[PDB]
């Protein structure tokens, strides 16, 4: 019960992040083609990892 009271308090609540940490996108590349271009619109990139 004390754990609940000290865990229901807002400043200390569970925070989880996906381990992959990657938006996953699949871009089609036809069989014979050798080149691919990935153009995506304006975005704030606020904290990109790579």
């Amino acid at each position: 019960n004390q754990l609940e009271l000290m865990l229901r308090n807002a400043t200390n609540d569970q925070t989880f992040v996906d381990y992959l940490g990657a938006k996953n996108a699949l871009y089609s590349v036809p069989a014979g083609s050798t080149a691919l271009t990935i153009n995506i619109p304006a975005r704030t990139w606020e904290g990109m990892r790579g």
């Binding site: 304006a42 975005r43 704030t44 990139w45 606020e46």
Partner: protein, 50 residues
């Protein structure tokens, strides 16, 4: 809370480096919190305060 009094998302600008002229502004969707479907009343206030 009332969403009419909620703080809006800021407008971030687009620079257009080559011409040098401003390319406009956009609603800063690239950094937004998902708070109405998973969050509810506890996180609506938090998102507004952020």
């Amino acid at each position: 809370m009332n969403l009419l009094n909620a703080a809006p998302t800021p407008y971030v600008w687009k620079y257009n480096p080559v011409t040098g002229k401003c390319a406009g502004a956009q609603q800063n969707y690239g950094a937004t919190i998902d708070w109405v479907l998973p969050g509810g009343n506890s996180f609506a206030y938090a998102a507004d305060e952020i």
